């Protein structure tokens, strides 16, 4: 499904992303926007045999298993298909584990490029959270 900006913000808040490890809700809303336009079914093939899945485009080479990616480590110990669900539960759990690594949200290039250091709070402003 394709979430509405505010709808996703509320959902992310419900899923505990606001201030998770020091990252305000805006960061996640902005990251989701640039990575997939709030689309849970978004996918992307990479030069290697890996694919990015979901609203936060998580990679199958390191974070999830799709049963057809060379060098899969499945850090999130989850089927990549779970990251394409209309229910964001799995994508959030994995995002939290990813951000729990030393490089925080820097794991998402789009976030660094389009959100890092910006007034991310603007992404949830106007919403009724």
């Amino acid at each position, epitope marked *: 499904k394709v979430f509405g900006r505010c709808e996703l913000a509320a959902a992310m808040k419900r*899923h505990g992303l606001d201030n*998770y*490890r020091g990252y305000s809700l805006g960061n996640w809303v902005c990251a989701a926007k640039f990575e997939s336009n709030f689309n849970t079914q978004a996918t992307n093939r990479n030069t290697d045999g890996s694919t990015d899945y979901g609203i936060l485009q998580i990679n199958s080479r390191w974070w999830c298993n799709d049963g057809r990616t060379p060098g899969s*480590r499945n850090l999130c*110990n989850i089927p990549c298909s779970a990251l394409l669900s209309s229910d964001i539960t799995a994508s959030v759990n994995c995002a*939290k*584990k990813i951000v*729990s690594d030393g490089n925080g949200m820097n794991a998402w290039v789009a976030w660094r490029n389009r959100c890092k250091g910006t007034d991310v709070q603007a992404w949830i402003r106007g919403c009724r959270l």
Partner: antibody, heavy 113, light 108 residues
Framework: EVQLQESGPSLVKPSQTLSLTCSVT????????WSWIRKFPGNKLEYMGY???????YYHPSLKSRISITRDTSKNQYYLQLNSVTTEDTATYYC???????WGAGTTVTVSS | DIVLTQSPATLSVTPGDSVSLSCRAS??????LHWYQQKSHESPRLLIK???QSISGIPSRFSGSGSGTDFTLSINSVETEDFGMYFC?????????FGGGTKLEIKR
């Protein structure tokens, strides 16, 4: 399935270093984040710290300076080092996955002279 | 550091009765609260993650609810093998911290 096992000296003298090994079986040590948790005498649990895939580590500030967590990819094990211990470091030490789905049986380490 | 306060310190029940355990956070932690069970001579076992998410392989009588600073672990009809310690743990901020635990004991 993945299983963890702690091992190491069960007795450490005050001021010396405590060392523990966690052997990972069933999966690679580089395919998950790993941590150390200790349980003091009165059901007091302390999350000592963890090591993530990038090698980055997070240590409990109470411990900060004394603790070090490392891993060995060829042996598929990760370790805990805690310097200058005192009797207050006597506890049951556990290694576990960051997710908390897998835990070792735990091993007691006593600090005494 | 975030402080987690669990109450009551101890709870005595008869197998078959249902119970509710409380865990309060000194700061809001959204849904980043986890529940662990630890029996005597055994290591901790994860029962509920992120406040209310069920763990495949964990008995259905265990469920969790709450958000922010108020959480609850519920056990519908406590079974004989369910007695022991129960701890909550937050992963919202480093360092991760544990509650003091609640001891579930047998009533007689």
């Amino acid at each position: 399935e993945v299983q963890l096992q702690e091992s190491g000296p069960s007795l450490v003298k005050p001021s010396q270093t405590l060392s523990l090994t966690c052997s990972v079986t069933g999966d690679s040590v580089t395919s998950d984040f790993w941590s150390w948790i200790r349980k003091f005498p009165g059901n007091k649990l302390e999350y000592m710290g963890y090591i993530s895939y990038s090698g980055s580590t997070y240590y409990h500030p109470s411990l900060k300076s004394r603790i070090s967590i490392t891993r060995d990819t060829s042996k598929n094990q990760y370790y805990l080092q805690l310097n200058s211990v005192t009797t207050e470091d006597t506890a049951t030490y556990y290694c576990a996955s960051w997710g908390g789905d897998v835990w070792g049986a735990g091993t007691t380490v006593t600090v005494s002279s | 550091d975030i402080v987690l306060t669990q109450s009551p310190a101890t709870l005595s029940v008869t197998p078959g009765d249902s119970v509710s355990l409380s865990c309060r956070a000194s700061q809001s932690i959204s849904n980043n609260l986890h529940w662990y069970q630890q029996k005597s001579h055994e290591s901790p076992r994860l029962l509920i993650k992120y406040a209310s998410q069920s763990i495949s392989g964990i008995p259905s009588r265990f469920s969790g609810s709450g958000s922010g600073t108020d959480f609850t672990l519920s056990i519908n009809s406590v079974e004989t093998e369910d007695f022991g310690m129960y701890f909550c743990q937050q992963s919202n901020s480093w360092p991760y911290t544990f509650g003091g635990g609640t001891k579930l004991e047998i009533k007689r």
